[PDB]
Amino acid sequence: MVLYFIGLGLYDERDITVKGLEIAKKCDYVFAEFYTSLMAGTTLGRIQKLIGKEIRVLSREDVELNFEKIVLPLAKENDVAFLTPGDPLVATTHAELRIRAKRAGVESYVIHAPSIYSAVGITGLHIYKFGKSATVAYPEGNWFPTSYYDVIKENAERGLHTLLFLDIKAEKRMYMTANEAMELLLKVEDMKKGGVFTDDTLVVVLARAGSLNPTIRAGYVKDLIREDFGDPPHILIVPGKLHIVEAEYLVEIAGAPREILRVNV
Amino acid sequence: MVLYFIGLGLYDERDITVKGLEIAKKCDYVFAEFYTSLMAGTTLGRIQKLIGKEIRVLSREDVELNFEKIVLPLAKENDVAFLTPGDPLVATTHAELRIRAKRAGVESYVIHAPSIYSAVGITGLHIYKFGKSATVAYPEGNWFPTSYYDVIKENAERGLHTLLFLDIKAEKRMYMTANEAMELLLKVEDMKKGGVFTDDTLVVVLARAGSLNPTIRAGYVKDLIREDFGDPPHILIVPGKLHIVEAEYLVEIAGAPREILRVNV
Numbered sequence A, B: 001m002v003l004y005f006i007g008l009g010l011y012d013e014r015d016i017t018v019k020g021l022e023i024a025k026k027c028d029y030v031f032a033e034f035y036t037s038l039m040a041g042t043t044l045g046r047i048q049k050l051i052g053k054e055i056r057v058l059s060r061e062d063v064e065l066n067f068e069k070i071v072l073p074l075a076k077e078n079d080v081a082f083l084t085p086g087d088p089l090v091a092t093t094h095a096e097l098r099i100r101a102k103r104a105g106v107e108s109y110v111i112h113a114p115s116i117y118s119a120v121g122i123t124g125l126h127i128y129k130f131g132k133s134a135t136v137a138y139p140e141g142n143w144f145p146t147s148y149y150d151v152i153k154e155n156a157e158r159g160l161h162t163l164l165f166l167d168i169k170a171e172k173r174m175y176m177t178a179n180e181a182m183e184l185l186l187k188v189e190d191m192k193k194g195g196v197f198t199d200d201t202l203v204v205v206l207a208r209a210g211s212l213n214p215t216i217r218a219g220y221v222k223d224l225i226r227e228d229f230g231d232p233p234h235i236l237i238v239p240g241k242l243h244i245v246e247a248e249y250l251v252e253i254a255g256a257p258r259e260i261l262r263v264n265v
């Protein structure tokens, strides 16, 4: 009778909310997609074991083109769940699927889960200070995406931090590292020369949020661009002007150069 | 020797993650704070029964002034949990507590949970389009703060959405309603005349996010200002120019008038 969109969280199968788990366990059919993000600390098997249900994984094509043919038909006479990494409606286009559900006469409900969008709070940067977000996409052929550079410029001008989601090519098992994102940004900088992203720019890297020991590092691009931040997923952040407490946390917790403690007010 | 910052999530006792629950259950001591926000869909008793541990609630003073006197001494020789509504470290004052832990020679780990910051994705508005966030504070005496109005102005002129956290008197457990926020914003507009918030402004109200039955409503201030959005908590969003997909979700899912499809896109 219903369709549930349930987030699985940041890193492993235990990042699902108790609410989401109890609801999933009682659903008749369970579908899921693992192309919008990477849960580096679990496997399909462990997720299936926790929920006690077989999980039918769908590809991007299955979802975007055939969601109404694969999932919705069952939701008309059964309780169906659609699982996704992190929060199902953050930096995905899954919200549109609720419209398809409605038009198909299917009621849908959303169960949230920890998202990287809010988890960056662990970097010590004030969440309210984050401005517009952007995605660093892999260049393809003659096409080299650069909109994310303008976003950083716009936020920085306002003293706001910029969250940069990094690209993912699930089927090819490609996960953009913070290092690759920094390299692309330097290239865009040489092209636009806006002084937005250089070797002297302070950046923050958060890798495998959700795990108990995520990698949290802050420093200048010149020093971090070749640093090993561990396995993906990674997210890159370009902070705006720092408040004293933000700088203190980056130094004490993220190993940033003590010199950033001296904010230029 | 270990302190766990564990998020309780959005609304009720089941919004904690499985990871958070299992870790909390094994902790020797469990503390909690309910001053950064509240858990409107549950009670201390229900949270205690779920975790199966006595929970010592701490006031803002207990934490800000005495975190190292009350919590850290126990964390030095035991496993201690510190529960917070939402996702830990979204609240600005949380981060610094990890530095206190470090100074006391205590290891700390963060267990994330859903935050309203990311849960607003259920409004159908693209997460990347949210700019700087702000809090609408109740005016009192001769004090009439209005910085949140400027935040909306700066975001909107850049085509970005503005997430407005509404004031809460945690201690007294009194919540500002979206209606009161709209009244205040109209009040501020009449004083600043910036043309930022008027009867013709399109707003989105999200009430009781996390619940299976949150109220999601979109429409013009003139129509929503006296509407009943149900019990707290309420969140108010002033969207910037909309992508057609965002507008269609607001119409189909949030009952927005068809007019937004031609006026706000």
Ligand SMILES: Nc1ncnc2c1ncn2[C@@H]1O[C@H](CSCC[C@H](N)C(=O)O)[C@@H](O)[C@H]1O
Residues within 6 Å of the ligand: A010, A011, A036, A037, A038, A085, A086, A087, A088, A089, A090, A091, A092, A114, A115, A116, A117, A164, A165, A166, A167, A168, A206, A207, A208, A209, A210, A233, A234, A235, A236
């Ligand atoms: N645990 C994690 N650690 C670091 N980055 C993460 C992450 N989970 C997701 N990301 C980042 O976000 C991108 C996916 S965007 C989809 C996000 C998801 N709906 C959520 O709510 O988190 C990844 O390519 C990566 O850059």
